[PDB]
Amino acid sequence: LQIPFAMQMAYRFNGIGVTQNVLYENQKLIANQFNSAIGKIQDSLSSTA
Amino acid sequence: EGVFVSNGTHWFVTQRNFYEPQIITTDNTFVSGNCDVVIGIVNNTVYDPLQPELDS
Amino acid sequence: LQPELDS
Ligand SMILES: *[C@@H]1O[C@H](CO)[C@@H](O[C@@H]2O[C@H](CO)[C@@H](O)[C@H](O)[C@H]2NC(C)=O)[C@H](O)[C@H]1NC(C)=O
Ligand SMILES: *[C@@H]1O[C@H](CO)[C@@H](O[C@@H]2O[C@H](CO)[C@@H](O)[C@H](O)[C@H]2NC(C)=O)[C@H](O)[C@H]1NC(C)=O
Ligand SMILES: *[C@@H]1O[C@H](CO)[C@@H](O)[C@H](O)[C@H]1NC(C)=O
Incomplete structure (x- = not known):
């Protein structure tokens, strides 16, 4: 079923009791934390086999 | 309850896993913040059960 | 609410 991604994360937040x-009052901040944590994984994997 | 949806003319609340629309009210919705903050927010009435009865 | 309906 298609669903807008900022709605999917609002239900996943509701699933952890938050x-x-x-989410909606903090959406851009949350997205920046997600995008930054994705960035750190490239660095982490690039550092050592 | 679940999700806001529209058929193109009216807005409803419905449960996530079986389409069953109901009117939007003070009882199936709750407040936070104000209309400036949220991304993709839209305008509609939310009905109040109380006042039209307590008028009489 | 009905018992409150004096007003
Ligand atoms: C969206 O849903 C509403 C409620 O089912 C529809 O509104 C009704 O429309 C009929 C005519 O099609 C009227 O006789 C009713 O009085 C309306 N009800 C209300 C509460 O206004 C509306 O037609 C639907 N729109 C679409 C595009 O399906
Ligand atoms: C939702 O309703 C409000 C009014 O209740 C609309 O707000 C006004 O919008 C115009 C155009 O953007 C502004 O010039 C006014 O300054 C706004 N007034 C206030 C009090 O903020 C709003 O645009 C509506 N939103 C939608 C998507 O329909
Ligand atoms: C959805 O995308 C359209 C452009 O296709 C844009 O005008 C609109 O503002 C977007 N709405 C949201 C809630 O992201």
Whole structure:
């Protein structure tokens, strides 16, 4: 079923017992933390076999 | 309950896994913040059960 | 709410 991704994460937040407005009031900040953590994985894997 | 949806003319709340629309009210919805903060928010009424009864 | 409906 198609669903907008900022709605999917609001339901996944609700699944950990955090009220879904905690995502919408912070959406850009949350996305920047996700994008930064993705960045660190390239560095981590590039550092050693 | 679940999800906001529209058929193109009206907005409803519905449960996530079986399409069953209901009117949007003070009882199936809750407040946070204000209309400036949220990305992709839209405008509609939310009905109040109380006032039209307590008027009489 | 019905018992409150004096007002
Ligand atoms: C969206 O849903 C609403 C409610 O089912 C529809 O509104 C009704 O439309 C019929 C005519 O098609 C009217 O006789 C009713 O009085 C309307 N009800 C209300 C509460 O306004 C609406 O037609 C639907 N729109 C689409 C495009 O399906
Ligand atoms: C939702 O409704 C509000 C009014 O209740 C609209 O806000 C006004 O929008 C115009 C155009 O953007 C601004 O010039 C006004 O300054 C706004 N007023 C206030 C009090 O903020 C808003 O645009 C509506 N949003 C949608 C998507 O329909
Ligand atoms: C969805 O994409 C359209 C462009 O295709 C854009 O105008 C609109 O603002 C976007 N809405 C949201 C909620 O991201």
